[PDB]
């Protein structure tokens, strides 16, 4: 499956979490930003790689990246 990595420039804006259509991301308490929350990717085995999370990130470049790796049935989005 693909790998979703989140770096320390996240500001807890939750935009990446809301933009995720397959419910891969989540919010976990943190202490490095004002919101005291950081994104997390506990269910990367369901990610397809649509890059909506990257599209929604407001920080300079991205605090979240998706690297496409091994393709499974879930990752390839196959209904058959």
């Amino acid at each position: 499956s693909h790998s979703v990595k989140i770096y320390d420039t996240c500001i807890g804006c939750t935009q990446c979490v809301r933009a995720c259509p397959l419910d891969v991301l989540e919010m976990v308490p943190w202490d490095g930003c004002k919101a005291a929350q950081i994104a997390s990717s506990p269910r990367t085995e369901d990610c397809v790689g649509c890059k909506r999370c990257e599209t929604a990130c407001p920080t300079d470049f991205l605090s979240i990246r998706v690297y496409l790796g091994a393709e499974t049935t879930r990752s390839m989005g196959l209904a058959y």
Binding site: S3, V4, K5, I6, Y7, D8, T9, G12, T14, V17, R18, C20, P21, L22, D23, L25, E26, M27, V28, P29, W30, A36, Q37, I38, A39, S40, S41, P42, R43, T44, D46, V48, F61, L62, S63, R65, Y67, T73, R74, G77, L78, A79, Y80
Partner: protein, 139 residues
């Protein structure tokens, strides 16, 4: 086990396939306050029963799209929908929401996963980890 009356639907050719009976399928359950009509993620419109409704789909993305439609396209907001994964062996795995709290909001008890302690500009050069089985982000 899973309990619920299927919504009133005439059926369509965009429904399940052999994967559901061979690999896996998904189920979504929700309590509608009143009977109404909602758009099938597979095409067409279906009338959903008052009370508990249960629906089978082929992909998790379709189930979550239906859940988003339920949450955002009805004045009485449907917040109790649960999405499970159904294996051919009969085992039911509960998927969404993970802990009864929507991921859009922070809830104490979750464990950070996939979080790096460095900026994206501090990743190592490939030449330092070549001939290894890793990637610059993986290290």
């Amino acid at each position: 086990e899973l309990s619920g009356q299927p919504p009133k639907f005439g059926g369509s050719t965009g429904g399940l396939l052999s994967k559901a009976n061979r690999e896996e399928k998904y189920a979504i359950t929700w309590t509608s306050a009143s009977e109404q009509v909602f758009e099938m993620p597979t095409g067409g419109a279906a009338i959903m029963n008052e009370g508990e409704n249960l629906l089978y789909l082929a992909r998790k993305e379709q189930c979550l799209a239906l859940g988003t439609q339920l949450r955002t396209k009805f004045k009485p907001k449907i917040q109790d929908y649960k999405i499970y994964r159904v294996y051919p062996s009969g085992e039911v795995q509960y998927l969404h929401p993970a802990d009864g709290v929507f991921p859009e909001k922070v809830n104490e008890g979750r464990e950070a996963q996939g979080t790096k302690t460095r900026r994206i500009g501090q990743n190592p050069e490939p030449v330092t980890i070549k001939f290894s089985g890793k990637a610059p982000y993986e290290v």
